[PDB]
Design a protein around this ligand. Structure first.
Ligand code: CLA
Ligand code: CLA
Ligand code: CLA
Ligand code: CLA
Ligand code: CLA
Ligand code: CLA
Ligand code: CLA
Ligand code: CLA
Ligand SMILES: CCCCCCCCCCCCCCCC(=O)OC[C@H](COP(=O)(O)OC[C@@H](O)CO)OC(=O)CCCCCCCCCCCCCCC
Ligand SMILES: CCCCCCCCCCCCO[C@H]1O[C@H](CO)[C@@H](O[C@H]2O[C@H](CO)[C@@H](O)[C@H](O)[C@H]2O)[C@H](O)[C@H]1O
Ligand SMILES: CC1=C(C/C=C(\C)CCC[C@H](C)CCC[C@H](C)CCCC(C)C)C(=O)c2ccccc2C1=O
Lengths: 51, 144, 144, 80, 741, 164, 74
């Protein structure tokens, strides 16, 4: 597929394309990224103690 | 009477079992500096690259990678042992250049026929201000 | 050999301080090679456009992330007990206790409480809705 | 290539040449002193700028003077 | 007789004429000042005896009588502590209740309100609670009265004036010749046999005839004024046979080789004395007997005046191999005509002995009621690690001075010492790698645990409930050395300490010593110790091997040992000298030993020390070492912040002096950064601006103000860094451990 | 009562803190026999303490919100309200001794420069000379202001410069 | 650093209400240490612990991150 410098520059860049544009939607694993989950129980309290 | 001695690499090295402080890959690309002297008697000097080598009678050929590594060798070969060395400069195309007694006489003593480069016929307290030498193409000291 | 385009005395430097001094005296315009005083003032004057275009892109960034990831429309109604929001968090190195401990201020995902206090400055200059903050962001992004 | 420029306050005691660890300096005739000699720097291509010359000049407000210029592979003192 | 007394009669006139002329020792200083660098070079070059003269005999006489000056000052120092042990102490009251009465031997004067430093240490007494543990020496010596402390204080003043006489006599009146000092066979035969051998024979005889019957009566329970005085324990054999029933057999079982009949008072018990927490004294008595027989045998090794015995020139020159060329040829000649080559090997092991001493005394506490005194235990460990650590850096300093000054490239050709220099690039670079390997793989485990605990991922840390890095090898040795009285040491009644396992010793409701279980936090911190020592080795050994030359500076030995630099050339040559490597090594010795004493002071308070109730013994910090030493934040929270609450709110109490020096050494530490960061050519120009205002008001001094030298401003800087750094930890440790322990 | 303050003889947090300290000394005193020198020392500490509070209220020191003696370093508010002993008396009690040490050290350096080598007599202090200037410098403001009027105090532009 | 220590600690004692806790302790340098640096860093360094973590852990991590860059500067 690739044998020169500028062909390898394209294939590394396009493989970086093919991972990252999928990683935002299909590649966010259920166990890996807890941000790509649902809104869990609580947390939205005041900063504590006083104001 | 004196002019520009050449070199043969046939002359023997000092007996030294080799150190890791010696040459590097710069000797194969840029330059490496070889040093010669004529020893009267067999005795033991210090390598400037660490250790101790013994010199043998007659010519002695040694090689380094810096200019200070050769002149810090002649400094202990002239002051301690009263020998008269001279070191050269070898390029990897085989070219060689004569360096230290560049007019025969050592540079502490007058030869009366060497040219006085890099001098100012004025006092160091009489330099100009840097506002005058500003915009001199490149950045430039007022002592020029 | 090519990176300090301003200082050719650094372009002849075979060492790794060529990289460090290509960075640090790149904005020392008075010491570049071939710099003249008419050439001096023009690069300073364009660089001040470069500082201004960064500031307005920076401020339009503050207007954007507050309008999108912040709770300015929620903070308008209760400006004491509701804590401000700078910008939401996407760090995939997080764990699940580090998601739910940073969800605060009544938001959905993890958030940062803005301590810069651009809500209080915007709330008193008339900003009330997020649609008033996107317009300010697109305006400064044009001006930048 | 460092900039070594010496001045007329030289007295020609040649302590700078003996102190130079790189043979940058040499002694040229000059009538402005009793010792009839003034230094010269024909080999500033080889200078590192270690300033052992102007540690050794006796004259007040040193006669030899080294200006640290642009550093080549010989000015940085490199075996590599 | 090649080994013979050889002195010179009256080399130096005893005269005050040279005290009138300061700087008389050196040519460069005897012409008086013109500059304030004179009076700093006076004190710097004062004891640089190798630089005064060239004569090795005159050097040797100067270091021989200066050693009597150091010994004479130690005899003043010891006699102070026995005197302050006698007239201002509670050692009378401490022996009757050595569980509740805190040891105290310094009493202050009530003037400015500083009498509040006289705390309520118990025993009808007020004074500074000491921590140097002399009262545990003295119960181990069986002192029992303040008369005995006063008589050995007068014996200390007498011995100090004898030592001051001896240095005066052996320099001014009758000073030895050079070949007296160069009998190193005769010195080792006398020091192994007479000093170390007969010393531990004599002290065992003090332990047999004095300390054993006194401390047997104290453990059985007798008030100290009712115990027989120890000279009655000599003159009456029938008293000794009441306690140990084998003194009735006399010294007949010794010469009849019936040594098993001495088993009452020369024992091999091991473990600890459960009445008092310390080691068994009959165990330490059979120790110093068998130490003495070992050294008196080893003191007849070297050949002096009869053909028997070894000769160290032949011993060295015969051990040569195929890998090292000449082998050890020529090391005898440089260890005999060079003091720095001696001083390097001596300060290495004598510094390494001090760290052996520190680790072997918390684990095997040799003194009665030493282990329960948590203040004494913390200080005696911490002190003897630092005193070791300075002396190890002194080995690196004075080995470099040998390479600069007394090294001879002529007589060193293809020996070990010549071949170490010839592959010094391979030495430093493989040491450079293993420091970088230990850098990431020890400290990056802490950054990993910080990040995982901050990212809410505690299952991904390196802890015991997580990725477990167990110290498998050290846990294996604790499983062997505790099972060592089974079949590898069958005559031991117990183990050699209680760190290896077993049960604890409860003395006074406090833990003397309980077993130490090693975990993943102990794994990480021991590799922190391996890291900081290898970097300290890296800097000091680089200064030794590149003392003379490098690829950077080929003529470095001509510049000397202590020079600043070779100038701004070749990129800059700041701190290239061999002085400057032992400048930088002091920070890493400070960095290494701080983590040693932090790992001591928190492992003990979490897992050893603490009160016992026979109801689930509780420790000082609750048992939170392996739970918390994973993270740098655990060292921040649970050690430097939680335990600092006894040094910061200790005002209005006797510990308030420790609160001052806690701020005092926080000042002096930071004061050093004025010297460690800045440089001379600033401060010289600032002096010119204030000499100007002193010129203007005609108060210009004759000794002209100069800024401190380049090496001096560094030496001032590391001296205030270490003084401000160590005295911070001193006052932090002691204000913690006196209150909670 | 000058700047929101109060006399320490009139404030109560001052007297509360005096009773706080004497409470701490007495509960420390209780552990010892009434003949014992660790109790003789503490009762001597109290009588230095109680006289100290008596003497601070005697001088009319100003307390505040915390019951501590506050100082007033302004003449015209210390001269007017009787508080020159706080700052305004020791600001001249100091500056007598300060310029005294300056003048003695000045006169020792001036009277050593006319010698063979004056650097030797900065190591080896001429004690019969230095004590002689020490005693006779006791009227140093009377001698300085006479030297101030001549022009012999200030050396002229013989002083050393770089590049004016 | 001196203007901001003094600003913050006079404002902490103002906003907590214990305005006398400053004026007692600001007169001597231990009160700067054991009442402002020691006392107010209680919940900072507890941003993450082996019990758990809270919203201060990003400022707890940076507080050790700041000590690390500082000492790398030496
Ligand atoms: C306010 C931001 C800003 C602006 C307006 C510029 C503007 C410019 N830079 Mg600069 N630069 C910046 C930040 C900025 N730089 C930063 C943060 C770095 C890293 C230290 C550099 C490093 C840098 C280099 C290395 C060079 C420039 C050059 C230039 C010029 C093209 C222009 C004047 C070039 C220049 O002036 O060459 C003539 C050039 O060679 N810049
Ligand atoms: C057996 C112990 C021993 C002995 C005999 C020597 C002997 C010597 N050392 Mg050496 N050294 C030692 C241990 C020893 N050292 C240790 C342990 C270290 C590591 C810290 C060093 C590090 C070292 C260096 C780096 C240098 C020497 C030098 C010297 C020589 C001259 C010293 C001199 O004149 O200073 C006279 C004494 C002083 C100037 C006193 C110093 C003041 C100290 C630093 C202040 C600390 C005092 C106290 C702890 C602080 C509290 C005091 C209080 C008032 C605040 C002399 C041969 C020097 C040398 O040979 O020069 C070529 C040199 O440069 N040594
Ligand atoms: C362990 C402490 C110690 C010891 C034993 C010595 C020992 C000595 N010092 Mg020394 N010194 C020390 C600490 C010490 N110093 C410290 C801390 C400093 C400050 C850095 C100096 C600074 C110093 C100077 C400046 C000089 C000495 C000198 C001497 C020698 C003269 C002996 C003498 O007059 O004694 C007799 C003194 C008595 C008090 C008799 C005891 C009764 C002797 C080797 C002198 C020397 O070696 O000249 C050749 C000298 O000029 N010392
Ligand atoms: C290691 C040496 C050493 C050290 C550090 C001390 C330290 C101290 N001694 Mg001590 N002392 C020592 C050796 C030492 N001593 C020896 C060897 C003797 C026997 C001659 C004495 C005899 C002695 C007496 C008799 C007293 C002290 C006192 C003191 C304390 C105050 C000293 C003072 O104000 O000096 C004054 C300074 C000058 C006169 C100058 C101080 C803690 C006093 C003390 O603690 O009172 C409770 C006190 O009364 N000492
Ligand atoms: C068996 C005899 C003997 C003994 C006991 C010693 C003991 C000692 N020597 Mg030594 N020495 C000996 C033979 C002996 N030497 C011989 C034969 C030589 C020549 C080859 C030397 C050459 C020598 C040097 C060059 C040096 C020593 C040093 C020392 C001291 C080590 C310091 C120490 O660790 O503190 C241990 C301290 C004690 C045990 C305190 C007790 C001190 C006793 C009373 C003095 C030593 C006994 C003395 C040698 C016997 C002669 C008595 C005298 C009245 C004639 C120590 C006092 C060093 C020293 O400190 O210099 C002073 C040192 O620099 N020695
Ligand atoms: C240098 C040390 C030293 C000294 C000064 C003494 C001195 C003495 N021992 Mg002693 N002893 C020593 C070491 C020493 N011992 C050691 C190491 C052991 C263990 C082997 C003994 C075991 C021993 C016994 C068992 C007895 C003595 C006895 C004696 C006393 C008379 C000796 C005799 O009869 O002839 C005498 C005071 C006898 C008496 O003592 C009160 C006696 O019964 N000793
Ligand atoms: C906390 C401050 C600090 C730190 C981090 C260092 C770090 C280091 N010093 Mg050092 N030093 C310091 C203070 C410090 N020093 C001070 C104050 C002095 C004054 C005396 C010195 C004096 C000194 C000497 C004299 C020597 C060192 C050496 C070393 C190195 C050995 C450790 C190593 O390789 O581990 C690796 C690095 C670390 C553990 C740092 C943490 C990095 C983490 C674990 C991972 C890296 C982050 C990762 C790549 C993510 C990057 C993000 C991306 C965006 C770039 C290393 C570069 C020695 C050396 O260089 O030879 C070995 C040496 O000879 N230093
Ligand atoms: C920075 C200088 C300064 C300031 C702000 C004040 C401020 C004040 N002074 Mg004042 N004062 C000062 C220096 C100063 N003084 C000095 C140096 C003197 C000369 C010793 C005086 C002499 C002085 C007198 C004599 C009086 C004041 C008064 C006053 C108050 C009006 C006010 C509080 C007056 C006052 O009490 O209020 C009317 C008053 O009577 N001051
Ligand atoms: C430790 C492992 C050392 C290996 C060991 O066995 O050393 C022994 C070997 C020398 O053996 P010889 O028997 O030649 O040595 C006789 C000795 O008396 C020294 O001459 O050392 C070398 O080969 C050089 C060591 C460099 C090795 C550095 C590795 C780190
Ligand atoms: C330095 C020389 C090395 C040898 C060490 C000598 C140290 C000097 C010790 C002298 C003290 C007297 O020591 C010796 O006194 C008595 C006379 O034998 C002995 O006492 C014994 O002998 C008496 C008569 O025989 C009887 O009362 C008993 O048998 C018993 O009491 C002691 O068991 C012994 O301690
Ligand atoms: C502060 C500083 C100085 C200035 C320090 C001055 C020169 C010395 C400090 C004071 C000295 C100790 C004189 C004070 C004591 C004198 C003996 C005079 C005594 C007079 C009375 C106090 C008795 C340097 O010279 C310097 C040099 C190189 C790197 C860093 C620094 C540096 O940080």
């Amino acid at each position: 597929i690739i044998s020169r410098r500028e062909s390898l520059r394209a294939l590394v860049a396009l493989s970086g394309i093919a991972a990252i544009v999928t990683y935002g939607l299909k590649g966010a694993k259920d166990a890996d990224l807890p941000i790509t989950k649902g809104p869990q129980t609580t947390g939205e309290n005041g900063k504590g103690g006083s104001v | 009477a004196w002019t520009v001695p050449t070199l043969n690499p046939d002359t023997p090295s000092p007996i030294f079992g080799g150190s890791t402080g010696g040459l590097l890959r710069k000797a194969q690309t840029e330059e490496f500096y070889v040093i010669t002297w004529e020893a009267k008697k067999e005795q033991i000097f210090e390598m400037p690259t660490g250790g101790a080598a013994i010199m043998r009678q007659g010519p002695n050929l040694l090689k380094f990678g810096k200019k200070e590594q050769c002149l810090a060798l002649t400094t202990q070969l002239r002051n301690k042992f009263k020998l008269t060395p001279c070191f050269y400069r070898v390029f990897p195309d085989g070219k060689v250049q004569y360096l230290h007694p560049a007019d025969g006489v050592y540079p502490e003593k007058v030869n009366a026929g060497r040219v006085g480069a890099n001098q100012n016929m004025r006092r160091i307290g009489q330099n100009v201000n840097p506002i005058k030498v500003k915009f001199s193409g490149r950045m430039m000291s007022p002592a020029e | 050999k090519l990176f300090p385009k301003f200082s050719q005395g650094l372009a002849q430097d075979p060492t790794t301080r060529r990289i460090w001094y290509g960075l640090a005296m790149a904005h020392d315009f008075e010491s570049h090679d071939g710099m003249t005083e008419e050439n001096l003032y023009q690069k300073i004057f364009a660089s001040h456009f470069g500082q201004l275009s960064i500031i307005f892109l920076w401020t339009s960034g503050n207007l954007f992330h507050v309008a999108w990831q912040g709770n300015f429309e929620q903070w308008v109604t209760d400006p004491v007990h509701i804590r401000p929001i700078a910008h939401a968090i996407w760090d995939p190195h997080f764990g699940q206790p580090a998601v739910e401990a940073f969800t605060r201020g009544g938001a959905s995902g993890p958030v940062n409480i803005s301590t810069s206090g651009v809500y209080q400055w915007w709330y008193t200059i008339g900003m009330r809705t997020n649609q008033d903050l996107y317009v300010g962001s697109v305006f400064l992004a044009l001006v930048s | 290539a460092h900039i070594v420029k010496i001045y007329d306050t030289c007295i020609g005691c040649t302590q700078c040449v003996r102190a130079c660890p790189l043979d940058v300096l040499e002694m040229v005739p000059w009538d402005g002193c009793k010792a009839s000699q003034m230094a010269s720097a024909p080999r500033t291509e080889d200078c590192v700028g270690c300033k052992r010359c102007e540690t050794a000049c006796p004259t007040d407000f040193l006669s030899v003077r080294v200006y640290l210029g642009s550093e080549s592979t010989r000015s940085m003192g490199l075996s590599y | 007789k090649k080994v013979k007394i050889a002195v010179d009669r009256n080399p130096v006139e005893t005269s005050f004429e040279k005290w009138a002329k300061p700087g008389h020792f050196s040519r460069t200083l005897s012409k008086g000042p013109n500059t304030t660098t004179w009076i700093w070079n006076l004190h710097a070059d004062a004891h640089d005896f190798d630089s005064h003269t060239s004569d090795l005999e005159e050097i040797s006489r100067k270091v021989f009588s200066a050693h009597f000056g150091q010994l004479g000052i130690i005899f003043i120092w010891l006699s102070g502590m026995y005197f302050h042990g006698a007239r201002f102490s509670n050692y009378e009251a401490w022996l009757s209740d050595p569980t509740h009465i805190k040891p105290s031997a310094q009493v202050v004067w009530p003037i400015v309100g500083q009498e509040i430093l006289n705390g309520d240490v118990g025993g009808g007494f007020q004074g500074i609670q000491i921590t140097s543990g002399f009262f545990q020496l003295w119960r181990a010596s069986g002192i029992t009265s303040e008369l005995q402390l006063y008589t050995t204080a007068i014996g200390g003043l007498v011995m100090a004036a004898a030592m001051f006489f001896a240095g005066w006599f052996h320099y001014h009146k009758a000073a030895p010749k050079l070949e007296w000092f160069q009998n190193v066979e005769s010195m080792l035969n006398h020091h192994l046999g007479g000093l170390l051998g007969l010393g531990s024979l004599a002290w065992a005889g003090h332990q047999i005839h004095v300390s054993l019957p006194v401390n047997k009566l104290l453990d059985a329970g007798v008030d100290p004024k009712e115990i027989p005085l120890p000279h009655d324990l000599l003159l009456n054999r029938a008293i000794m046979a009441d306690l140990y029933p084998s003194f009735a057999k006399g010294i007949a079982p010794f010469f009849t080789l019936n040594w098993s009949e001495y088993s009452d008072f020369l024992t091999f018990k091991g473990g600890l004395n459960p009445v008092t927490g310390g080691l068994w004294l009959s165990d330490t008595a059979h120790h110093h007997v068998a130490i003495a027989v070992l050294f008196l045998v080893a003191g007849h090794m070297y050949r002096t005046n009869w053909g028997i015995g070894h000769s160290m020139k032949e011993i060295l020159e015969a051990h040569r191999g195929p890998f090292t060329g000449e082998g050890h040829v020529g090391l005898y000649e440089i260890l005999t005509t060079s003091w720095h080559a001696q001083l390097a090997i001596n300060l290495a092991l004598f510094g390494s002995l001090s760290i052996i001493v520190a680790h072997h005394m918390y684990a095997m506490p040799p003194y009665p009621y030493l282990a329960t005194d948590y203040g004494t235990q913390l200080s005696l460990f911490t002190h003897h690690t630092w005193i070791g650590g300075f002396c190890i850096v002194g080995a690196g300093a004075h080995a470099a001075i040998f390479m600069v000054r007394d090294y001879d490239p002529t007589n060193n050709y293809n020996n070990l010492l010549d071949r170490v220099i010839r592959h010094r690039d391979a030495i430093i670079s493989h040491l450079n790698w293993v420091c970088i390997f230990l850098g990431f793989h020890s400290f990056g485990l802490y950054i990993h645990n910080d990040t995982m605990s901050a990212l809410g991922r505690p299952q991904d840390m390196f802890s015991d409930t997580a990725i477990q890095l167990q110290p498998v090898f050290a846990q294996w040795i604790q499983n062997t050395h505790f099972l060592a009285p089974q079949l590898t040491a069958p005559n031991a009644l117990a183990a050699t300490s209680l760190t290896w396992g077993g049960d604890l010793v409860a003395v006074g409701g406090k833990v003397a010593m309980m077993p130490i279980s090693l975990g993943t936090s102990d794994f990480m911190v021991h590799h922190i110790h391996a890291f900081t020592i290898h970097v300290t080795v890296l800097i000091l050994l680089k200064g030794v091997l590149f003392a003379r030359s490098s690829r950077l500076i080929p003529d470095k030995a001509n510049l000397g040992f202590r020079f600043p630099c070779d100038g701004p050339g070749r990129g800059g040559t700041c701190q290239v000298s061999a002085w400057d490597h032992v400048f930088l090594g002091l920070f890493w010795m400070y960095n290494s030993l701080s983590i040693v004493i932090f790992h001591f002071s928190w492992k003990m308070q979490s897992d050893v020390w603490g009160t016992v109730t026979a109801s689930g013994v509780s420790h000082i910090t609750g048992g939170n070492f392996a739970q918390s030493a994973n993270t740098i934040n655990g060292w921040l929270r649970d050690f430097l912040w939680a335990q600092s609450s006894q040094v910061i709110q200790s005002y209005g109490s006797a510990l308030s002096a420790y609160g001052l020096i806690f701020l005092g050494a926080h000042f002096v530490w930071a004061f050093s950064l004025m010297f460690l960061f800045s440089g001379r050519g600033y401060w010289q120009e600032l002096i010119e601006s204030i000499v100007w205002a002193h010129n203007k008001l005609k108060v210009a001094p004759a000794i002209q103000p100069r800024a401190l030298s380049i090496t001096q401003g560094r030496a001032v800087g590391v001296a205030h860094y270490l003084l401000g750094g160590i005295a911070t930890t001193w006052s932090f440790f002691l204000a913690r451990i006196i209150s909670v322990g | 009562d000058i700047a929101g303050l109060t006399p320490c003889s009139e404030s109560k947090a001052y007297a509360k803190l005096e009773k706080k300290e004497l409470k701490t000394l007495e509960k420390r005193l209780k552990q010892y026999e009434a003949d014992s020198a660790p109790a003789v020392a503490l009762k001597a500490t109290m009588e230095r303490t109680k006289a100290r509070f008596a003497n601070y209220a005697k001088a009319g020191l100003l307390c505040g919100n915390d019951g501590l003696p506050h100082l007033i370093a302004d003449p015209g508010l210390a001269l007017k309200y009787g508080h020159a002993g706080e700052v305004f008396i020791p600001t001249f009690g100091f500056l007598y001794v300060a310029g005294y040490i300056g003048y003695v050290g000045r006169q020792y350096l001036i009277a050593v420069k006319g010698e063979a080598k004056p650097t030797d007599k900065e190591i080896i202090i001429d004690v019969p000379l230095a004590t002689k200037l020490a005693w006779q410098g006791a009227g140093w403001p009377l001698a300085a202001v006479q030297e101030l009027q001549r022009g012999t105090l200030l050396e002229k532009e013989e002083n050393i410069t770089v590049s004016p | 650093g001196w203007v901001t220590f003094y600003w913050h600690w006079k404002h902490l004692t103002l906003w907590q209400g214990n305005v006398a806790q400053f004026d007692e302790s600001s007169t001597y340098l231990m009160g700067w240490l054991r009442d402002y640096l020691w006392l107010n860093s209680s919940q900072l360094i507890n941003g993450y612990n082996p019990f758990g973590m809270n919203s201060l852990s990003v400022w707890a991590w940076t507080f050790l991150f700041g000590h690390l860059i500082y000492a790398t500067g030496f």
